[PDB]
Write a protein that holds these residues in place. Sequence first.
Motif, PDB file in Angstrom:
ATOM      1  N   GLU A  30       0.909  -1.097  -0.075  1.00  0.00           N
ATOM      2  CA  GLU A  30      -0.084   0.023  -0.063  1.00  0.00           C
ATOM      3  C   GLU A  30       0.802   1.244  -0.043  1.00  0.00           C
ATOM      4  OE1 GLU A  30      -3.184   0.012   2.809  1.00  0.00           O
ATOM      5  OE2 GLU A  30      -3.379   2.181   2.500  1.00  0.00           O
ATOM      6  N   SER A  69      -5.796  -5.236   3.626  1.00  0.00           N
ATOM      7  CA  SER A  69      -6.858  -4.126   3.400  1.00  0.00           C
ATOM      8  C   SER A  69      -8.054  -4.423   4.116  1.00  0.00           C
ATOM      9  CB  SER A  69      -6.991  -3.972   1.785  1.00  0.00           C
ATOM     10  OG  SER A  69      -5.805  -3.521   1.309  1.00  0.00           O
ATOM     11  N   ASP A  73      -4.168  -7.710   0.072  1.00  0.00           N
ATOM     12  CA  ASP A  73      -5.875  -7.638  -0.080  1.00  0.00           C
ATOM     13  C   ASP A  73      -6.230  -8.176   1.390  1.00  0.00           C
ATOM     14  OD1 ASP A  73      -5.540  -6.632  -2.591  1.00  0.00           O
ATOM     15  OD2 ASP A  73      -6.403  -8.480  -3.403  1.00  0.00           O
ATOM     16  N   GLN A 106      -7.664  -3.974   7.596  1.00  0.00           N
ATOM     17  CA  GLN A 106      -7.646  -2.157   7.843  1.00  0.00           C
ATOM     18  C   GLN A 106      -9.093  -1.846   7.680  1.00  0.00           C
ATOM     19  OE1 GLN A 106      -4.427  -2.129   4.604  1.00  0.00           O
ATOM     20  NE2 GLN A 106      -4.611  -0.026   5.659  1.00  0.00           N
TER      21      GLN A 106
END
Lengths: 178, 178, 178, 178
Positions: B12, D111, D108, D114
């Motif tokens: 990221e 993510s 992913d 998160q």
Amino acid sequence: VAQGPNGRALAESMNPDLLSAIQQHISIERYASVTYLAMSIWCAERELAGFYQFFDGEAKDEQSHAVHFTQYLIARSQSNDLQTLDAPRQNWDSLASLMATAFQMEADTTSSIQSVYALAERNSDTRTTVFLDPLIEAQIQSEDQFAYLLGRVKFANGDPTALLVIDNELRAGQTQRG
Amino acid sequence: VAQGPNGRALAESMNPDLLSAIQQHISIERYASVTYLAMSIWCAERELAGFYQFFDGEAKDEQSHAVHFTQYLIARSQSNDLQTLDAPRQNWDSLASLMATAFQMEADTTSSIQSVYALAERNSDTRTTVFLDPLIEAQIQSEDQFAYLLGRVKFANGDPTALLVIDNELRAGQTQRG
Amino acid sequence: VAQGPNGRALAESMNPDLLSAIQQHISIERYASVTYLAMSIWCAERELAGFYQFFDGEAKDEQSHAVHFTQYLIARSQSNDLQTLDAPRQNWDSLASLMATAFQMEADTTSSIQSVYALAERNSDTRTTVFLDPLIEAQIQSEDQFAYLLGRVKFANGDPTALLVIDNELRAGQTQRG
Amino acid sequence: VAQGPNGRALAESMNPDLLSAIQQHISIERYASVTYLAMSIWCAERELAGFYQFFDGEAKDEQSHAVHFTQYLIARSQSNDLQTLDAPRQNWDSLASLMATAFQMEADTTSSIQSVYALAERNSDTRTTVFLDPLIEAQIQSEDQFAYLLGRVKFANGDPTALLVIDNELRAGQTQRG
Ligand SMILES: [Cl-]
Ligand SMILES: [Cl-]
Ligand SMILES: [Cl-]
Ligand SMILES: [Cl-]
Ligand SMILES: [Fe+3]
Ligand SMILES: [Fe+3]
Ligand SMILES: [Fe+3]
Ligand SMILES: [Fe+3]
Ligand SMILES: [Fe+3]
Ligand SMILES: [Fe+3]
Ligand SMILES: [Fe+3]
Ligand SMILES: [Fe+3]
Ligand SMILES: [Fe+3]
Ligand SMILES: [Fe+3]
């Protein structure tokens, strides 16, 4: 094969002035020994048992250095000449004053080795400079150690309590910066 | 798969201001390292061998923190930028003054981490806040430890005898409240 | 007993130009450290984990050399002067180019020691030449080692397969001719 | 004492959207598991035994993460809802392409965590953010590891010899920068 002055087979002749300088330096080592013996006694007379043990060991070590030098002369097939040994200093007004003499004695021992070293270099005596190299290395450590003990004693500023603490450090073997 | 600025695969993207803040913080850690090295030398010059050993270890630890941060940037696929490092302070009038600088340096290191933390929160960078959490935890302990050493040195009130006692505590590894 | 510039008892004064040369050399060692840190990061960014581990260790070793020199100045009762540290190089087009910089850095470190050595000889400072002797000895081994790593990387001729093999050698600790 | 939706005593209610997000994330972990199983099979079909062993272990680890999350819902007295699991991808043109999918799958997964984290923060659910913190920490390491494996495979540039070397690294357990 040539015979050296002490009667052994001679690998290479040694300049007589260099030989005299080494014989004189052996006396310096021996004088350092008896001086540390005198200092050990001064400390014992004042119940500074850790300082007494430290200097008692330093006296034996300085004698060992002297013998190490006599062995080098044997190895070079040169005669030894053990000399009259002066009486050591035996009186000090304080531990700080005694430690100052000890430091100066250590530095003076190095100066003597340095003087022999320069003479060997002037005579291209590489065996002798190689022989002295580790001894100078040891002197650096001894000078560092005696600067540490002297500076720590001076920091105590004559306070008996601080001197007892340092005395106990020395008895425990805590004798350098580490 | 996207490529990060350092060329590795990018999980990221990182905000450039946060990246700059982390790179600057690495310099703070490195500056703490060389400052503790300077403090270790100041202590060694005054025969405070326990303080010398303590700060010699703190310098290596601060360097380890700096490297830990460089590894985080690698892991995030961000470029490192190792910066010019200022000369440390090297002169203090007393151990108490040196310990005050050390405590403030530790607190300033935490403030730097806190500033990075706030920036990560503003950018919703949870990887970074999670990364910093244990480091802040360690800072709490380091601040507690340096408050202990500073307060104990101040309690000594400049008495060389008490400072020798504390110096010996540090050489023995007695460096916090425990 | 005389006091040295750093305040400790002084065994023998040091020429100010020699002192400056030693202080500057400490900066060279520190600069080698941060350069190897930069190289370790470059290698980590390219997944060359063995090279990363090797240079991470070299960085810590160069820092240890720097501290060793600061201890010598303490032992000689000379002041240290920790200097501003330049940013390291951080960009290379290939591992072969990085290894060339590393070898040159090692040879440049030896040249710096040689320059200090010559100055000590000009000043008849035998303590310093004796201090430097084992460090030059270590430099010979380090130069031999970096010539080995550089030559082996060049032999690979940029083939990623050969570079992966060498990378694994380094991770295993196979870092010199043996 | 209140009863939670799964029937156990309830320490504090959980927002239904956060609950749904955690249940969906469990499916992501399970999907990562079966994806790594598919990747392990692809590698086994091509005699890449080290990659097969690596991904076989990653599949079991991802399943363990999924169960860890189901245990958190139990601990919060929330119902689990194990969902339909999609078929994994099973075809790749090269190991480099497979490793790209694996890295993206890992990113992913982070993510997803998160997104749950942000929802917990919006709902002031500190139990959940504390629960997720070590999992994000582990994701940083996994992302670093998969960036390493992917980058090393890409460095091989499709050379079977280099891929066999890396395959053997993985069989030996050499799976990250270390
Ligand atoms: Cl006294
Ligand atoms: Cl003070
Ligand atoms: Cl190359
Ligand atoms: Cl491939
Ligand atoms: Fe002697
Ligand atoms: Fe002596
Ligand atoms: Fe730090
Ligand atoms: Fe710190
Ligand atoms: Fe070096
Ligand atoms: Fe070097
Ligand atoms: Fe030598
Ligand atoms: Fe997972
Ligand atoms: Fe995962
Ligand atoms: Fe935490």
